[PDB]
């Protein structure tokens with residue numbers, strides 16, 4: 001900690017406070033995160049140091065001293081949430097939406113290939129620079145520490161991007177949870193409105209159910225026997241997708257639809273999404289960032 005000088009509080013996370021800081025010795029500018037420790041967390045966080053990729057915010061160092069826990073990450077200047085807000089009036093241009101999606105699928109394809117999931121993708125852990133890069137933050141941390149309802153500051157954690165298998169009490173998460181979340185974020189970038197903004201687990205389930213039809217054994221084998229499934233769930237009809245994310249084009253709707261399949265095994269993998277025709281004309285535009 002004392003090897004660093006706190007420049008400014010650049011937010012709070014689930015796991016503790018996040019500071020912009022500078023390495024007193026090297027002068028490197030970093031993101032310093034103090035975590036709220038057990039040996040598994042240590043070995044898990046250390047595995048994460050190796051898991052390096054241009055679309056994953058780099059874990060520079062893991063400091064376990066004074067029996068306390070700090071994570072030094074590569075520093076980025078903006079998240080996608082703030083960028084989206086800055087962009088409200090005309091929205092992010094589709095090329096830039098496409099490039100962002102393409103890059104994140106690249107990061108997911110990487111980590112998923114090492115069996116590492118995020119479990120908690122949301123616009124606030126997607127970080128952008130002025131090179132036109134976007135990066136996943138806090139990758140792997142959820143399996144390292146443990147996902148809570150309220151943050152240390154009692155901030156309610158968002159359910160907006162949570163995959164239906166989790167909401168339904170599935171104990172065992174596959175990589176498909178991240179595709180689902182990414183799909184939600186994809187839709188949000190296009191419409192300028194969150195896809196499923198639930199404010200409770202049942203409200204979240206039921207917003208998904210309303211848009212996508214109440215899942216049954218036809219589309220989702222084994223759904224009825226899931227821990228929090230209840231026959232008493234209301235039965236909604238799937239809506240049109242042309243109604244869900246206009247004015248996104250055929251390719252995009254085609255892609256989004258596969259990222260939002262109910263059955264996690266039928267959900268498109270990151271790997272396969274990269275090969276989807278939507279990405280045929282992909283480019284890497286530079287955003288206008290006001291820092």
Ligand SMILES: NS(=O)(=O)c1ccc(Nc2cc(N[C@H]3CC[C@H](N)CC3)nc3ncnn23)cc1
Nearest residue numbers: 010011013018031074075076077078079082125
């Ligand atoms: N609000 S903002 O757009 O000006 C902004 C967003 C992010 C950061 N930088 C940042 C912020 C951040 N904090 C987030 C991390 C995810 C967590 N769920 C919420 C805090 N972690 C980071 N890792 C590397 N950079 N970085 C700085 C400004």
